[PDB]
Design an enzyme around this catalytic site. Structure first.
Site, PDB file in Angstrom:
ATOM      1  N   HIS B  40       0.820  -1.223   0.000  1.00  0.00           N
ATOM      2  CA  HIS B  40       0.000   0.000   0.000  1.00  0.00           C
ATOM      3  C   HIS B  40       0.862   1.285   0.000  1.00  0.00           C
ATOM      4  O   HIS B  40       0.454   2.292  -0.580  1.00  0.00           O
ATOM      5  CB  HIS B  40      -0.997   0.005   1.174  1.00  0.00           C
ATOM      6  CG  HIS B  40      -0.389   0.242   2.521  1.00  0.00           C
ATOM      7  ND1 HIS B  40       0.019  -0.806   3.315  1.00  0.00           N
ATOM      8  CD2 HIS B  40      -0.173   1.405   3.184  1.00  0.00           C
ATOM      9  CE1 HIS B  40       0.484  -0.258   4.426  1.00  0.00           C
ATOM     10  NE2 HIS B  40       0.387   1.070   4.395  1.00  0.00           N
ATOM     11  N   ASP B  66       0.066  -7.788   1.798  1.00  0.00           N
ATOM     12  CA  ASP B  66       0.489  -6.384   1.785  1.00  0.00           C
ATOM     13  C   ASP B  66       2.028  -6.278   1.929  1.00  0.00           C
ATOM     14  O   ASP B  66       2.531  -5.322   2.517  1.00  0.00           O
ATOM     15  CB  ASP B  66      -0.257  -5.565   2.867  1.00  0.00           C
ATOM     16  CG  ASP B  66      -0.057  -4.064   2.808  1.00  0.00           C
ATOM     17  OD1 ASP B  66       0.098  -3.525   1.688  1.00  0.00           O
ATOM     18  OD2 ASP B  66      -0.030  -3.429   3.886  1.00  0.00           O
ATOM     19  N   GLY B 139       3.334   5.512  11.059  1.00  0.00           N
ATOM     20  CA  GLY B 139       4.708   5.807  11.459  1.00  0.00           C
ATOM     21  C   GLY B 139       5.639   4.624  11.620  1.00  0.00           C
ATOM     22  O   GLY B 139       6.846   4.814  11.756  1.00  0.00           O
ATOM     23  N   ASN B 140       5.111   3.384  11.622  1.00  0.00           N
ATOM     24  CA  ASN B 140       5.980   2.206  11.736  1.00  0.00           C
ATOM     25  C   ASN B 140       5.558   1.104  10.748  1.00  0.00           C
ATOM     26  O   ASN B 140       6.230   0.077  10.647  1.00  0.00           O
ATOM     27  CB  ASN B 140       6.055   1.692  13.176  1.00  0.00           C
ATOM     28  CG  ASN B 140       4.742   1.342  13.850  1.00  0.00           C
ATOM     29  OD1 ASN B 140       3.695   1.114  13.220  1.00  0.00           O
ATOM     30  ND2 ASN B 140       4.795   1.246  15.162  1.00  0.00           N
ATOM     31  N   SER B 141       4.475   1.352   9.986  1.00  0.00           N
ATOM     32  CA  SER B 141       3.941   0.464   8.954  1.00  0.00           C
ATOM     33  C   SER B 141       4.989   0.283   7.839  1.00  0.00           C
ATOM     34  O   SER B 141       5.397   1.261   7.206  1.00  0.00           O
ATOM     35  CB  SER B 141       2.635   1.036   8.405  1.00  0.00           C
ATOM     36  OG  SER B 141       1.959   0.106   7.582  1.00  0.00           O
ATOM     37  N   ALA B 158      -0.222  -1.717   8.731  1.00  0.00           N
ATOM     38  CA  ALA B 158      -1.307  -0.910   9.303  1.00  0.00           C
ATOM     39  C   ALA B 158      -2.601  -1.125   8.501  1.00  0.00           C
ATOM     40  O   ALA B 158      -3.167  -0.200   7.921  1.00  0.00           O
ATOM     41  CB  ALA B 158      -0.929   0.570   9.383  1.00  0.00           C
ATOM     42  N   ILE B 159      -3.041  -2.389   8.476  1.00  0.00           N
ATOM     43  CA  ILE B 159      -4.289  -2.901   7.894  1.00  0.00           C
ATOM     44  C   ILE B 159      -4.946  -3.814   8.952  1.00  0.00           C
ATOM     45  O   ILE B 159      -4.255  -4.287   9.861  1.00  0.00           O
ATOM     46  CB  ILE B 159      -4.116  -3.625   6.521  1.00  0.00           C
ATOM     47  CG1 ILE B 159      -3.328  -4.969   6.622  1.00  0.00           C
ATOM     48  CG2 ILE B 159      -3.559  -2.689   5.434  1.00  0.00           C
ATOM     49  CD1 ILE B 159      -4.170  -6.264   6.868  1.00  0.00           C
ATOM     50  N   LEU B 160      -6.255  -4.109   8.790  1.00  0.00           N
ATOM     51  CA  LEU B 160      -7.011  -4.963   9.705  1.00  0.00           C
ATOM     52  C   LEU B 160      -7.697  -6.109   8.952  1.00  0.00           C
ATOM     53  O   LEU B 160      -7.104  -7.176   8.773  1.00  0.00           O
ATOM     54  CB  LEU B 160      -8.041  -4.131  10.495  1.00  0.00           C
ATOM     55  CG  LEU B 160      -7.483  -3.329  11.684  1.00  0.00           C
ATOM     56  CD1 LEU B 160      -7.027  -1.932  11.261  1.00  0.00           C
ATOM     57  CD2 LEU B 160      -8.511  -3.220  12.803  1.00  0.00           C
TER      58      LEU B 160
END
Lengths: 184, 183, 184
Positions: B40, B66, B139-141, B158-160
């Site tokens: 992403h 991802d 910030g850490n993804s 940083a996905i769910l």
């Protein structure tokens, strides 16, 4: 060798159960009688699933809407492990807390943090506050100390701050629900 | 003298990069300049901690996990991260999520391994995926999820539920990088 | 015996005040209290229940810092202050509050980011990032290290994204606000 919360989490594992009715977790308080503490909102037929995959039928003994506490009795119990319970009155802001769950029955879910606030000093009255994440994956489950003893029951019905029902209150309201069921 | 996570974070600092529409990335192979990041997030440029800028080519991605593999054009003096066996992970193990977006400095979150695989979320496809209560944000993804030794256990995505973060385990991202390297 | 953050939190308790928000006693003799400009007739309430009048000395909108002087101070406990320049990402942080004097609120975490490293937004260059929850219950209060020394002042107005004004800057702006109100 690295420090971890996994050595204490493994001894507690069989006492934390999956609740299917529509999912949540639960805690075995009495193994002989098969008494399991969980949440009211979770149950509004009930089946309980252990860590080893074993499925059991469960009857609703009673509930308390205000504390979101519900007591269940498993139908024909056997080889159950119960949790050790700690005096929640001895809790202090700053004590370490671990929120454990087992929804779906596929495995343990744990969050870590501290006891953030006690009583009316945060944001209900009788509730416990924690910065350990309380979500649908551990709601109904146990809030433990570093000894693996129950200090509270997690509830997600109501930032980074979570609510748990203190064990002393969870134990008392279970006794009151047991006693009433004995007049019936 | 106070205990801190900064000593282990200082040794891991050069292996975590800024993927420049920004993000973080991890140096897996120092010699070949192979950098693991998120799909992403992604011409691509990589920025080290020491300020050095490098060109980077996309050599393959996986939309479902991802993950994205990048190769640094003309690499030199690169520090790679040590990688740990993610199969040996247990719920309750401590995890630190590190990043370096914008290249301005290190970002870190702390927590524990919360759930392994479908244990926390029974959604089809969520198998293998590690769960952590260490905050996973923009910030850490793309960055590293580390143990207390500073070894890679996962790649931050940083996905769910809320309060829980998802990361690709190190064994799964290493075995996806191998597949992307060939075809 | 279990490890806890409660032994250090008890020594720091009288230095954190009720202001709605929190505040920190920086000078016990002069009664100087640091709080958030956004939470600011002002009354302060100590842990022991004592309530005092407080006058606004001055504020800084950019740092969200406000310095108050306790009218007729007595038996005040001030906080120890640490050098925020010595902070490193990964250092442990505890965010303490006491809104409405009913009891201490604490969150735990680490120093997450410093020099605008976490969000490339102009104006954040002076602030501290923490994964310790910063909410209305500890905003104005103290950000502490494991020694119980002030490393920052919690500000909620600006997921593990919490902000705090570093102790060195908060100390500097207090003197500058004292000196200014002296020329006037």
């Amino acid at each position: 060798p690295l420090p971890s919360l996994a050595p204490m989490l493994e001894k507690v594992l069989p006492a934390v159960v999956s609740v299917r009715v529509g999912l949540g977790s639960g805690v075995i308080i009495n193994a002989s009688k098969g008494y399991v503490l969980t949440n009211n909102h979770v149950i509004n037929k009930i089946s309980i699933q252990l860590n080893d995959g074993r499925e059991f039928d469960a009857k609703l003994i009673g509930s308390d809407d205000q504390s979101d506490i519900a007591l269940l009795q498993i139908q024909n119990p056997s080889k159950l492990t119960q949790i050790a319970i700690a005096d929640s009155d001895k809790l202090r802001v700053g004590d370490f807390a671990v929120a454990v769950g087992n929804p779906f029955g596929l495995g343990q879910t744990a969050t870590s943090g501290i006891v953030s606030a006690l009583g009316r000093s945060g944001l209900l009255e009788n509730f416990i506050q924690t910065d350990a994440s309380i979500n649908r994956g551990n709601s109904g489950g146990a809030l433990l100390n570093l000894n693996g003893e129950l200090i509270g029951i997690n509830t997600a019905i109501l930032v980074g701050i979570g609510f748990a029902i203190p064990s002393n209150m969870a134990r008392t309201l279970a006794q009151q629900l047991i006693d009433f069921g004995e007049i019936l």
